[PDB]
From a paper:
Blood-stage vaccine development was bolstered by the identification of a well-conserved complex used by P. falciparum merozoites to invade host erythrocytes. This complex was initially found to be composed of reticulocyte-binding protein homolog 5 (RH5), cysteine-rich protective antigen (CyRPA), and RH5-interacting protein (RIPR). RH5 plays an indispensable role in mediating merozoite invasion by binding the erythrocyte surface protein basigin.
As expected from epitope binning, MAD8-502 bound to a site on the top half of RH5, with an epitope consisting of helices 4 and 6 and the loops joining helices 3–4 and 6–7. Infection-acquired MAD8–151 and vaccination-derived MAD10–255 were even more similar, as they shared all five V(D)J genes, had identical lengths for all six complementarity-determining regions (CDRs), targeted the same region of RH5 (bin II), and had very similar potency. Aligning the structures of these vaccine-derived antibodies to their naturally acquired counterparts reveals that each pair bind to RH5 with very similar poses. An overlay of RH5 bound to MAD8–151 and MAD10–255 shows that these two antibodies bind with an almost indistinguishable binding mode, overlapping with a backbone root-mean-square deviation (RMSD) of 0.57 Å. Moreover, contact residues between each antibody and RH5 are almost entirely conserved, using the same residues from CDRs H3 and L2-3. Both antibodies make identical hydrogen-bond-mediated binding interactions with D331 of RH5, and several nearly identical interactions with residues F209, K212, N334, N338, and E341 of RH5.
Numbering used by the authors:
A (entry chain A): 156 to 454
B (entry chain B): 1 to 118, 133 to 241
Write the structure that this text describes.
């Protein structure tokens, strides 16, 4: 059920998007399969212009189905904006449980709209699968007992290696400690706020944003573990699949194995980056509320 | 390469169902689109329907009440069953392979087989019906759609006695191996196929085809000959 495999992103204030994780992995898998299939032979390299154009057509059709939930998604953005801003004239200062109920109800409607369009998304996914497998089935060798692996090598060098270097230049585990330190600082402040104030609207707003940041952190932690596991696996596997020959059936298996590893890595790297953006966009607004409490109001 | 071959009775009585088989070789039925297209003598190409994604079907609404398209994955074949048949169903029947509807081009066509029987559509206006030109002449064939079809337009070439083949896809993209003297232009409702300098090997019938909406529809065709 894709209803339990959707990540929600809020990369900038007033913006919200969703990713159906198995659809993102599935589309990315067939993209690697399509590029590996045309880079296997020198004479098919020119097909990359067609592959690039076809992926854009897939992305445009997929986004069009996603846009059918825009009114429901915009209603969720409105609710979040009201719940996060005490100065919103519509923020009626309702109990934290009532705030959570409204937000969960609006979020449920977005997930229901997404589930309602599953068939539409599936038709697009199945076309991307056909596109990639069509090229894969065309792959050929002069001698099927000595197939070249230059396509696997060229594809890794030109499409994947830059992504591995980018992850290795970052310190994803230190990003996790930095986020945990921010959550702890907000938790210490929140307890101290309750001692001073009774049933203050800022306590409810801070609890609301802090709860959202805890969930974003958990998803970043979940995706970071996949990134760390997959960066090592890809580096170890790529060495076994290049500068050598394979029998065609084994070459085909290696291409599918590599596409599988790349898609799991890419899915989590892409989602971790958007979730990182979301965490810090929420923390800026939360820190603005802290400064308002401490330095604007004396408190 | 993937190859398609039609087979079945060439003569059908009005009391019998027109029943054809397409045997696929060089590749599997799998989740691809398996089409049946027909061409009544002297008339244009008519898309009958397709089986796709390992279980679904889209039929032309003009034939939907009397058509079935099915597969047998163990034999790697697909079938056409057209009932309530009349002399109007006499046509060359083609089976054709298609990979996606996102980019609705037909990439493999069977040679075709003659079978003799004893308003919402996007209308593709192709012109001229026939053309006669000298070697080195510029040739412009037009396709005008009754509705906006964005860039969802393809061109096919049918050389004498050969199967139809993809020439240009998505208005201006050349299929692999097609010479640079061919080009395609247009957008929305107006499209053109241009042969900058006609060569003897270009003698063929050309067809435009839209995939913006179902049913898939084709232009009436343009026969090009040397004068």
């Amino acid at each position: 059920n894709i209803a339990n495999s959707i990540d929600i992103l809020q990369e900038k204030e007033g913006h919200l998007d969703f990713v159906i994780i198995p659809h993102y992995t599935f589309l990315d898998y067939y993209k690697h399969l399509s590029y590996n299939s045309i880079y296997h032979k020198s004479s098919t390299y020119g097909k990359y212009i067609a592959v690039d154009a076809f992926i854009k057509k897939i992305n445009e059709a997929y986004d069009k189905v996603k846009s059918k939930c825009n009114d429901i998604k915009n209603d969720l953005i409105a609710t979040i904006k009201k719940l996060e801003h005490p100065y919103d004239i519509n923020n009626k200062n309702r109990a934290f449980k009532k705030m959570m109920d409204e937000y969960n109800t609006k979020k449920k409607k977005l997930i229901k709209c997404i589930k309602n369009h599953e068939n539409d998304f599936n038709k697009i996914c199945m076309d991307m699968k056909n596109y990639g497998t069509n090229l894969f089935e065309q792959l050929s060798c002069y001698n099927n007992n000595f197939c070249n692996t230059n396509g696997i090598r060229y594809h890794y060098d030109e499409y994947i290696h830059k992504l591995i270097l980018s992850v290795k230049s970052k310190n994803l585990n230190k990003d996790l400690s930095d986020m945990t330190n921010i959550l702890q600082q907000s938790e210490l402040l929140l307890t101290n706020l309750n001692k001073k104030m009774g049933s203050y609207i800022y306590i409810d707003t801070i609890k609301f944003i802090h709860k959202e940041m805890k969930h974003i952190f958990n998803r970043i932690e979940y995706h970071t573990k996949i990134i760390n596991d997959k960066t090592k696996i890809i580096q170890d596997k790529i060495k076994l699949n290049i500068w050598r020959t394979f029998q065609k059936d084994e070459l085909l298996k290696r291409i599918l194995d590599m596409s599988n590893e790349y898609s799991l890595f890419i899915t989590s790297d892409h989602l971790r980056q958007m979730l990182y953006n979301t965490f810090y966009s929420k923390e800026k607004h939360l820190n603005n509320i802290f400064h308002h409490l401490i330095y604007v109001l004396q408190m | 390469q993937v190859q398609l071959q039609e087979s079945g009775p060439g003569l059908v009585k009005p009391s019998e169902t027109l029943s054809l088989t397409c045997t696929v070789s060089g590749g599997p039925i799998s989740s691809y689109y398996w089409n049946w297209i027909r061409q009544p003598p002297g008339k244009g190409l008519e898309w009958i329907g397709h089986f796709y994604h390992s279980g679904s079907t889209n039929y032309n609404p003009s034939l939907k009440s009397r058509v079935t398209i099915s597969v047998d994955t163990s034999k790697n074949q697909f079938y056409l069953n057209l009932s309530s048949v009349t002399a109007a169903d006499s046509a060359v029947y083609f089976c054709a392979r298609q990979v996606t509807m996102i980019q609705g081009l037909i990439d493999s066509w069977g040679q075709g087989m003659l079978v003799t029987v004893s308003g919402s559509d996007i209308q593709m206006t192709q012109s001229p019906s026939s053309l006669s030109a000298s070697v080195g002449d510029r040739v412009t064939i037009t396709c005008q759609a009754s509705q906006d079809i964005n860039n969802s337009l393809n061109w096919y070439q049918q050389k004498p006695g050969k199967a139809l083949k993809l020439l240009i896809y998505d208005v201006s993209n050349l299929e692999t191996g097609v010479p640079s003297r061919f080009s395609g232009e247009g957008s929305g409702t107006d499209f053109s196929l241009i042969i900058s300098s006609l060569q003897p090997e270009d003698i063929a019938t050309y067809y435009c085809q839209q995939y913006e909406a179902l049913p898939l529809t084709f232009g009436g065709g343009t026969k090009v000959e040397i004068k």
